[PDB]
Amino acid sequence: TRIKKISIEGNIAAGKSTFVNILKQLSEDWEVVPEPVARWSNVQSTQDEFEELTMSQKNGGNVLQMMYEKPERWSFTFQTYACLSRIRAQLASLNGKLKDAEKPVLFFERSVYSDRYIFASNLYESESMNETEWTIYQDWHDWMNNQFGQSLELDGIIYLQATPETCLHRIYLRGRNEEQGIPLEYLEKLHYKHESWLLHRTLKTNFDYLQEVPILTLDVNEDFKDKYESLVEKVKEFLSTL
Amino acid sequence: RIKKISIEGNIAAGKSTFVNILKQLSEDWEVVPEPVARWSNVQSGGNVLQMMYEKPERWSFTFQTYACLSRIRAQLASLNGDAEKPVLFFERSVYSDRYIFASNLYESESMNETEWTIYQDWHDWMNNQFSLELDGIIYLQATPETCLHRIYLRGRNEEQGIPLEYLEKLHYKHESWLLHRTLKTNFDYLQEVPILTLDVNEDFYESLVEKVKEFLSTL
Ligand SMILES: Nc1ncnc2c1ncn2[C@@H]1O[C@H](COP(=O)(O)OP(=O)(O)O)[C@@H](O)[C@H]1O
Ligand SMILES: Nc1ncnc2c1ncn2[C@@H]1O[C@H](COP(=O)(O)OP(=O)(O)O)[C@@H](O)[C@H]1O
Ligand SMILES: Nc1ccn([C@@H]2C[C@@H](O)[C@H](CO)O2)c(=O)n1
Ligand SMILES: Nc1ccn([C@@H]2C[C@@H](O)[C@H](CO)O2)c(=O)n1
């Protein structure tokens, strides 16, 4: 409970990775849990202790690609594993980083809440998950959180706000293969969910504390150098209020 | 302190019937049933059991994840909620979920390589967190023909189309895991858990119940 937990939220290619990985260098007390995107593009489970000595860990399926190619078939599968992989990364880093730090802060790239309330919810609303899939999913997520929830509770949220058009541009800059067919319209739906959750705060979750969690909203539409100074100043001022 | 004993066996071998009888021998003895009701009426209603049998290539992964999720939830709940020698009997376990049912689906191509890899990762992680380790297993052994008859007897709508060949496959995995002990899991302690095998092919027992009473005293 000593470690402050801050989630960085924003649409696909808003610049969360870029920002927080540059941000964390400012303090030895600051670390980041990246999102497990690579685990989704190359799906692998653990090898047997003898088998790994003679067999390579091969590249597996790309469930990320599967979800984008056929959302109505693969959404449930993808969202389940996205959330599983995140909880795993976040719980291990909480248990193992920043043991001694004076004022330790762990920044999470997204959270289990955006997994459910933004991404999966948007899939359900789009009829990419039917009623049964959506029910199973929330049942699972609810249960995981009653177990592995207290430890993962956020002290604050930093919302990196970029327009859908900026995000689409940045998807192209970044060049991640599975995202190259994403339409403006999809990013726009994701944009609206983040705005409802983080800016207007009209989106109600099953997690009551989140109605109160402090939120810092940052505009990241400009080129990185143009606003970075003010952004840093704002983050520092925000962290000192938690 | 609670002793945990899993009852294993093919579909309709008689596990619910057997453990419901067994339970009455002692107030120190409780059961955790397989949450089948929750599978045929998916609530927070869809029938994911039926979906799995009707369209296995579409719904197998989804069913297995929920089956195992609902099992873990129920077992952890019973553990947490003044008995001299407490015994908890689980109808099936997280191991049979993965190594008998989910594995059979993958072998039948009802789950693809990606689905199976995700399932296994999820199961590995879910059980590394979780207390549920067994002190013994009771294997109720019935032939696939006995099991098919008992499916019909019971009359669960979702199950009525199951062919003998599907039950034969499940039978072979059971015998490999529990009789021959040739099925390997990534769960080391399981190779040492004692197993009581009980033949339940005949019409129902008194004796079989007594045999358990005593197996437990060796644990
Ligand atoms: N402020 C910015 N100005 C110009 N490019 C940016 C900026 N922020 C991020 N980028 C670029 O946008 C792409 C997406 O950034 P990334 O951090 O990977 O986003 P996220 O982690 O939100 O998906 C990357 O190619 C990165 O170089
Ligand atoms: N030994 C037995 N002899 C005759 N009927 C049995 C016997 N064991 C179970 N049954 C009946 O067989 C059907 C399946 O039993 P059940 O306990 O629901 O199986 P399981 O829990 O293994 O799926 C039920 O209708 C039950 O009454
Ligand atoms: N639960 C989540 C989290 C992230 N995403 C997408 C998949 C990728 O294209 C990016 C990765 O940040 O976002 C997603 O679709 N669902
Ligand atoms: N993990 C599991 C556990 C049980 N089953 C089947 C489904 C029903 O027909 C019966 C219920 O015992 O077993 C199953 O298919 N997968």
**Secondary structure of A66-80 as H, E, C letters:** HHHHCHHHHHHHHHH
Say yes or no: CB of residue B11 within 6 Å of ligand 2: yes
From B8, B30, B57, B91, active-site residue: B91
In whole angstroms, what is the distance from residue B123 CA to residue A79 CA? 16
A13 marked among binding-site residues: yes
A10 marked among binding-site residues: yes
Query: Residue B84: CB partners within 8 Å, gap ≥ 6?
Result: B28
> Which atom of ligand 1 is found nearest the CA of A221?
1
Q: Resolution of this PDB entry, in A?
A: 1.7
Return the SS3 of B196: strand
For chain B, what percentages of helix, strand and coil (3-state, to nearest 5) are there?
55, 15, 30
Establish, for the pair of chains A and B, how many residue pairs have beta carbons separated by less than 8 Å.
73
Residue in B65, B76, B106 with CA at minimum distance from that of residue A137: B65
In whole angstroms, what is the distance from residue A231 CA to residue A210 CA? 23
DSSP string computed for A119-185: IIHHHHHTTSS-HHHHHHHHHHHHHHHHHSSGGG--SEEEEEE--HHHHHHHHHHHT-GGGTT--HH
> Which atom of ligand 1 is found nearest the CA of A10?
22
Contact A24, A109 (CB under 8 A): no
Say yes or no: CB of residue B22 within 6 Å of ligand 2: no
User: Which residue of A46, A61, A84 is in closest CB contact with B114?
Assistant: A61
Residue type, A163: T
Return the SS3 of B127: helix
Each as own residue / partner, the long-range contacts of residues A49-56 (CB below 8 Å, 24 or more positions apart, any chain) are none
Tokens for B143, please give them: 């032939």
Centroid of ligand 3 to alpha carbon of B117 (angstroms): 19
**Cβ B114–A66 below 8 Å, yes or no?**
yes
**Cβ B121–A148 below 8 Å, yes or no?**
no
Paired sense of beta strands A156-161 and B29-32, if any = unpaired
Chain B residues in contact with A44 (beta carbon < 8 A): 117, 121
Size of chain B, expressed as the number of residues it contains: 219
CATH code at B1-219: 3.40.50.300
The CATH class given to the A1-242 domain equals alpha beta
**Cβ A43–B73 below 8 Å, yes or no?**
no
For chain A, what percentages of helix, strand and coil (3-state, to nearest 5) are there?
55, 10, 35
Paired sense of beta strands B87-91 and B3-8, if any = parallel
Beta strands in B66-186 (DSSP E): 87-91, 136-141
Each as own residue / partner, the long-range contacts of residues B66-70 (CB below 8 Å, 24 or more positions apart, any chain) are B66/A136, B66/A139, B66/A140, B66/B39, B66/B42, B67/B39, B67/B97, B67/B101, B68/B94, B68/B97, B68/B98, B68/B102, B68/B123, B68/B126, B69/A136, B69/A139, B69/A140, B69/A143, B69/B126, B70/B35, B70/B38, B70/B39
**B30 tagged catalytic:** no
DSSP structural state of residue A46: P
Chain B residues in contact with A43 (beta carbon < 8 A): 114, 117-118, 121
Residue in A172, A190, A220, A176 with CA at minimum distance from that of residue A23: A220
Paired sense of beta strands B136-141 and B3-8, if any = parallel
In whole angstroms, what is the distance from residue A234 CA to residue B188 CA? 52
Closest-CA distance of chain A to residue B179, Å: 23
Each as own residue / partner, the long-range contacts of residues A63-67 (CB below 8 Å, 24 or more positions apart, any chain) are A63/B114, A63/B118, A64/A37, A64/A40, A64/A178, A65/A41, A65/A177, A65/A178, A66/B114
User: Which residue of B69, B120, B121 is in closest CB contact with A143?
Assistant: B69
